[PDB]
Amino acid sequence: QGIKTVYASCRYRKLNEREIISDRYTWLHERMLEDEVERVLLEQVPAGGFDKTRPGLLLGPST
Amino acid sequence: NAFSSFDACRTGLLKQQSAAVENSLVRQNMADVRAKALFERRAVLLDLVEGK
Numbered sequence: 001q002g003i004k005t006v007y008a009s010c011r012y013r014k015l016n017e018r019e020i021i022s023d024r025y026t027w028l029h030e031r032m033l034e035d036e037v038e039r040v041l042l043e044q045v046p047a048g049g050f051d052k053t054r055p056g057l058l059l060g061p062s063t
Numbered sequence: 064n065a066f067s068s069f070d071a072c073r074t075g076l077l078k079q080q081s082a083a084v085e086n087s088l089v090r091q092n093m094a095d096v097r098a099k100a101l102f103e104r105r106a107v108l109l110d111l112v113e114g115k
Contacts, residue, residue: 059077059080059084060080060083060084060085061084061085
């Protein structure tokens with residue numbers, strides 16, 4: 001049991017390392033996909049950007 | 064076929080908002096005009112009031 005426990009400790013250490021790095025690579029993958037989506041979205045912004053002073057849609061009178 | 068229904072519901076909501084704004088504006092203006100007229104009526108009745 002002591003031999004098995006030593007071997008298991010080594011294996012679990014390596015596995016923890018691999019699991020951490022795997023989760024962080026998955027995180028980075030998702031963030032890179034988000035960045036790609038944002039990069040495509042920024043092409044749809046009109047020239048000169050948005051008029052942040054006014055409302056985009058004016059949906060009624062102001063008398 | 065789905066985007067048509069979506070756009071329809073969308074424009075319906077927009078029309079609802081516009082109509083709501085218009086009706087609220089009209090009601091507000093009517094109420095304010097009525098209040099002003101009542102105020103002038105009160106003014107003349109206070110000019111006519113009598114006693115001490």
